[PDB]
C-alpha cells in the first residue's frame, strides 16, 4: 500500500511500488512452482527472508548450473547456444518493467556475475565458457536497449557476426549469433550512463 522503509539492507527493501510488485512476481514463478493452493498469504510470506542474503546467494545458484551443464557437454562450446547452459534466466529479467540498471536490481546482479565469469576465462587454443552464442534479442536485454538499435550497431561495425548465413535469406532475432565475451566488453566500453 506504501513503502515507508528505513535501514533497508535487503535488495527487496527499497524503491517505488511497481518494482516491489515485480520482484514478487519473479520470485513466485521461479520458486513457488507448486500448483496454486490459494496459500495467498503463506506462499508469498517467505519471499522477504529469501532475499536477505541475495547479494551472496544468487551467484551460487548461477554457478551451480555452469558445472552441471558442463559435464553434460556434447559439442565444442563455441557452437553451443547460450540458452543451453543458463535456461533463459536472461529473459526473466524482463518481468520487472523498468529498463535501466540502477532500478532493476535483478538485472544488475546478473550482469555483475557475467562480467566476472568472462574475466576469469581469457581466450586460448581450446574453446571455453564465454564463447557461447547470444541471439539478437539477448544482446538487446544485456545492453539495455531495443533490438533495432543492435541492428544499427552491427551495421556500423562495432561488433562481429560469427555464423555465416545462406544467401537470399535473413537472420531472425531468435537465431544465436554473437559471442558472449564480445558483448560484455562492448558494454563496458561504450554503453555506460549515469543510471
Amino acid at each position: 500500500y506504501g513503502c515507508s522503509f528505513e535501514s533497508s539492507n535487503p535488495l527487496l527493501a527499497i524503491g517505488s511500488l511497481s518494482a516491489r510488485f515485480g520482484a514478487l512476481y519473479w520470485y513466485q514463478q521461479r520458486y513457488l512452482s507448486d500448483h496454486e493452493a490459494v496459500r495467498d498469504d503463506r506462499a508469498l510470506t517467505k519471499a522477504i527472508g529469501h532475499f536477505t542474503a541475495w547479494p551472496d546467494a544468487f551467484w551460487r545458484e548461477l554457478q551451480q548450473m555452469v558445472d552441471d551443464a558442463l559435464v553434460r557437454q556434447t559439442k565444442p562450446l563455441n557452437h553451443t547456444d547460450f540458452v543451453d547452459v543458463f535456461g533463459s534466466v536472461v529473459a526473466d529479467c524482463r518481468q520487472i518493467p523498468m529498463r535501466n540498471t540502477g532500478q532493476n536490481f535483478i538485472l544488475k546482479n546478473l550482469i555483475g556475475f557475467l562480467t566476472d565469469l568472462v574475466a576469469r576465462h581469457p581466450q586460448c587454443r581450446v574453446a571455453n565458457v564465454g564463447d557461447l552464442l547470444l541471439s539478437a534479442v539477448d544482446a538487446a536485454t544485456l545492453l539495455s536497449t531495443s533490438v533495432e538499435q543492435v541492428r544499427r550497431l552491427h551495421h556500423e561495425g562495432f561488433l562481429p557476426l560469427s555464423i555465416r548465413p545462406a544467401s537470399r535469406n535473413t537472420v531472425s532475432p531468435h537465431r544465436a549469433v554473437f559471442h558472449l565475451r564480445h558483448v560484455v566488453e562492448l558494454r563496458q566500453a561504450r554503453m555506460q550512463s549515469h543510471h
Binding site: H155, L161, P165, S167, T170
Partner: protein, 50 residues
Amino acid sequence: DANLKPKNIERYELAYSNPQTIEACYVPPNVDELYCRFSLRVEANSMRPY
C-alpha cells in the same frame, strides 16, 4: 536496378568473394633475359589485280 532502386541485397551478402578460374603466365625465378622471335616476308604484289 536502372540506377533507380538500389537492389534489396542485405549488407552481409556483398562481403562474399566471387571465385573464378584463369590462366596466367610468369617468368620463373633467376632468368636473366627473355627472347622473342618472328620472321617476315615482303612481296612486290600490289602492282597487279589478283
